[PDB]
Design a protein around this nucleic acid. Sequence first.
RNA 1: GUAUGUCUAAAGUUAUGUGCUCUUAUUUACUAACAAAAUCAACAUGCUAUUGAAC
Length: 261
Amino acid sequence: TIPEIQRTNLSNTLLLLKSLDVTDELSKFPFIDKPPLQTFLSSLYELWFIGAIDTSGQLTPLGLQMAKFPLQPSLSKILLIAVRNGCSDEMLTIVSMLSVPQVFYRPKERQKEADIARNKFFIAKSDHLTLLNVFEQWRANNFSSHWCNKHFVQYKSLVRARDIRDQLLTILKSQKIPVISSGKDWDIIKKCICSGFAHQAAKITYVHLKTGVSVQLHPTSALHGLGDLPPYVVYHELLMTSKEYICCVTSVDPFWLMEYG
RNA sequence: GUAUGUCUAAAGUUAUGUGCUCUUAUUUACUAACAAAAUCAACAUGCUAUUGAAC
Ligand SMILES: [Mg+2]
């Protein structure tokens, strides 16, 4: 089989491999099976964009700080930015939920009931803030497994989210960062998203911000349907399955995109 | 407007050196000189979007 390293985004890897001081030693690093040149150069471009890397290709202190999180660099960028923006408290649990697979359960015949249960937690802005409402309601039900099942959400995913939240909180308290809450000013989170995800943006026909390729909201999204259409979009992943799908979706204002990048 | 052309049957030698029986065109169908300037009669009474393996 082709090794994972030859076929995945590598920016977590390159961040860490710069964070330990393997330099242009990284640019010539002895792997068994070297990743494609354009994969390396693209991950370098991503890190340069995020400001983890300078124009020569050398690590910034922001890079070194981000590398102490167990994270792909965007998710560390957004947490560090959430300190200065003052939403660390919400950002912790949203970044925690964004790490986790298969958060909702959607069995063969029951697509309606699974979504109906999810839609009790709906935020009109995004999937991202709907994840917050899920974790808050889960906790308000004393983290109940039976509530998880009732609402078609995977408890394994939720317990892992809380374990990640407490770990990331520990990492922030190791970096001495304050865990400030934004409260109901959820736009602060959405401004932070622009700091991490400015490449991962799209606009209604959706159409990618930089490459211009046309793309689709995944049908699980709170923003999908025979229905909703917010003009400007930021997203957690782009993925081709049956279609070229944005995996989950958040609405944005264009002014934030040139504010953060 | 159903092209048209050539050939031959000649003369023998011109004197010397009835059954049977198919058929709702089951035809090998043949000719193109003829004409070509075709559009009234259209069209239903109201527009759509959907699903990922695993760590
Ligand atoms: Mg004539």
